[model samples]
Target: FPVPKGVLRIHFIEAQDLQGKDTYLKGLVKGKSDPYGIIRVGNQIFQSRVIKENLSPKWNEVYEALVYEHPGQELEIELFDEDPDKDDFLGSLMIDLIEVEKERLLDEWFTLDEVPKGKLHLRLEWLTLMPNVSNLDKVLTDIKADGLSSALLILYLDSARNLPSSNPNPVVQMSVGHKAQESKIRYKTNEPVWEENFTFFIHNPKRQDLEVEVRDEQHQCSLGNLKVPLSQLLTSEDMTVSQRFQLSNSGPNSTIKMKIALRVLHLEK
Candidate 1:
């Protein structure tokens, strides 16, 4: 399969002038709504925490998603009225991912569709990978610039082989510092193919590491683990590595195939 085009960094800022779907006293109460957001990119989903009794809500949350096929993929968002049972839809939006890529950066208010009078504010950034060191200027800066981020680490998890047969559902968990993400579980297979993409923003690659673990979801047991120091990628060919790593605490032949790369997060003059 082809690698992803790039990473889409979505800043789900806020919403304004939302529809008050929750009303009592036959539209006389005009009850304020508890609103939250549901974001989707392909099959990946992310939900924001609810803001109670607010028509204009500020989320200030960030989510990064992988864009594999941009022509056919879109960024979908929906605003909902949080209730004890069923949530009522306030508004929704669908944006073509290709537009964000072409623009490189976009920060604006999008009028929500399938609704009457609500708007959503969002900021979108397209991050590209720099595989070669030919574009390197220098490493003089010690502290962070805006957000304490130095580099972007991209990982493509391909498959696992020779896993424990007793494990019914197998999933992989990868983490860097305080950030962690999990892959989709594969049911009843020793050799599972994930083919998922994950990204991490590294604050300091010199002292950071990537921790990986394979777990049996059905049994709630760890199958294997692996740790990779980020400094190793700095010297690799074109700052990229693709190989099958031997699992640490599992079967002798257990291996996972992955492709990893690091790109500097640069700011222009």
Candidate 2:
């Protein structure tokens, strides 16, 4: 069994009295601040929608992130004033996530640590993951909204075969919009059984397509590719997807065995 995974929900409640470093009209009037927030947990980074013209902003934004390590990792928030030339740092706050694990929920106002000017209000929730698969449909029903999805794309890479013999070091590359990630490379194996799972945060599966390619690491050419229409998962049970798809640009019998699932994320109150 793999290590237990925890989900973290970040509530970007608000910020107050942010510094207006930008100037307009010959430095006579304060330039309207276009402020936004960026949060980082482990290596994962999420950005808040930009808010226009306000020193005191209430985002009320919520982000659900998978937390693999809570002990040494911290939740970092950086607020910036979006400008045409350069963005100005309004403030930053870093909180140890160990507290969230112990308390299950952490809510408080924090004084900004760096660059001067502003205080941040945050609410963090630690969610316990359930292994029971029956709750999948119920979770999606509650989080279901027309334009958005809390969909998690889990991919199980089993094996591949019939790859061309030119250069056999193979790796799998997958991308959905701007987010792109890859699996660990298996050297000199035409039939590489990674037995690995990769998870993706799909923004909107309706219009988005997941482009997957199995490439030869030495040759740097696509051995085969799969273009999956994410909308197909919407109609599936639990919005899930699992199948073995034949590879393109490879041999006639070449195919990769993979299982993919899309699940909505929820925070238990």
Q: What's the distance in Å from true for residue 242, model 2?
A: 9.8
Candidate 1: RMSD to truth: 5.0
Q: lDDT by residue for model 1 over 71-106, one digit each (tens)?
A: 569999999999888999999999988877788888
TM-score of 1: 0.71
**Top candidate, metric lDDT:** 1
Tens-digit lDDT string for candidate 2 (124-219): 877655433445466556556442334567667777877766458989988976678888899987788788887777656566788889898877
- TM-score of model number 2: 0.67
User: In each prediction, how many residue pairs overlap at the backbone (N, C-alpha, C within less than 3 A)?
Assistant: 0, 0
Any idea how many clashes model 1 has?
0
Q: What is the C-alpha RMSD of each candidate to the true structure, in Å?
A: 5.0, 4.9
> What C-alpha root-mean-square deviation, in Å, does candidate 2 show against the real structure?
4.9
TM for every model, in the order presented, reads: 0.71, 0.67
